[PDB]
Design a protein around this ligand. Structure first.
Ligand SMILES: *[C@@H]1O[C@H](CO)[C@@H](O)[C@H](O)[C@H]1NC(C)=O
Ligand SMILES: *[C@@H]1O[C@H](CO)[C@@H](O)[C@H](O)[C@H]1NC(C)=O
Ligand SMILES: [Ca+2]
Length: 254
């Protein structure tokens, strides 16, 4: 059989998610506690959320001038980027208060993740950035490619076992990227999740976005912008032939 490196997803559990939350960042902390960053001018926020209920336990509303983007948690601090700017915000997770700001050298601010030592960033280009959390200088730039094509639109990120997984904006795909060298290690296809919500009558929903990993219990959670549900998912390696050019069409929008 092929080393397909393409996965489909099974829903293990469904949980409520705020259908007014324009998800741009998603983090799993501990004890069924999530952190989330939302966008939209006048609606951007960082939130502590209970997994089981989707209840917002604590919220920090941003100034109306910002469009909140990616979010990650590193050593008790939540780091957040914002659309079109090089500024980012740091919140203490104990209080959800803004303790510090920073500036990074990306070309935009879309996604953040961490391996527990440094920050990874995306900005909608095909570059996955390594960012030093002390100096906020770039450590390295990985140019992510698939079959020679640039993988642009890298969006919400999550570090999982040596990989950085990235939503690709406006697709139902997640790229699995090597944190070591930027290699495209695999593609996850999730179109069944949005389709299921549309079929349940939730017609006003926006795109798949937001990935969070619970390392302790080995749970993967995903949601989407304005989605009324957040899903716990299990990956399954494909056991069928992927048509020529399928990933290029559906995940790279070529
Ligand atoms: C998570 O739950 C454990 C065990 O129930 C508890 O001791 C710990 O304080 C919790 N972690 C938090 C709230 O950060
Ligand atoms: C971060 O910068 C924003 C925008 O200028 C400002 O409102 C806030 O006070 C800053 N936070 C800190 C901790 O300096
Ligand atoms: Ca994430």
């Amino acid at each position: 059989r092929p080393s397909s490196r393409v996965y489909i997803v099974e829903v293990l559990n469904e949980f409520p998610h705020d259908p007014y939350a324009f998800t741009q960042g998603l983090v799993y902390a501990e004890n069924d506690t999530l952190f989330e960053s939302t966008g939209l001018y006048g609606r951007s926020s960082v939130r502590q959320v209970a997994l089981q209920t989707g209840k917002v336990e604590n919220i920090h509303k941003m100034d109306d001038s910002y469009f909140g983007e990616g979010l990650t948690l590193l050593n008790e601090k939540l780091y957040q980027v914002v659309w079109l700017k090089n500024i980012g915000f740091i919140y203490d997770r104990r209080t959800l208060s803004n303790i510090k700001n920073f500036t990074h050298q990306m070309k935009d601010g879309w996604g953040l993740a961490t391996d527990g030592k440094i920050l990874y960033g995306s900005d909608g280009t095909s570059i996955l950035y390594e960012i030093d959390p002390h100096t906020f200088k770039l450590i390295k730039k990985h140019n992510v490619k698939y079959n020679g094509h640039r993988v642009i639109r890298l969006n919400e990120l999550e570090y999982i076992n040596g990989e950085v997984w990235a939503n690709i904006w406006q697709t139902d795909c997640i790229a699995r990227i090597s944190a070591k060298d930027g290699t495209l290690l695999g593609w996850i296809l999730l179109p069944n999740l949005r389709k299921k919500l549309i079929d349940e009558g939730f017609r006003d929903i926006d795109v798949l976005n937001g990935i969070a990993w619970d390392q302790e219990n080995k749970r993967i959670f995903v949601t989407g912008k304005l989605w009324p549900k957040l899903f716990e998912i299990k990956l399954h390696l494909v056991r069928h032939r992927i048509p020529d050019g399928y990933i290029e069409r559906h995940c790279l929008n070529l």
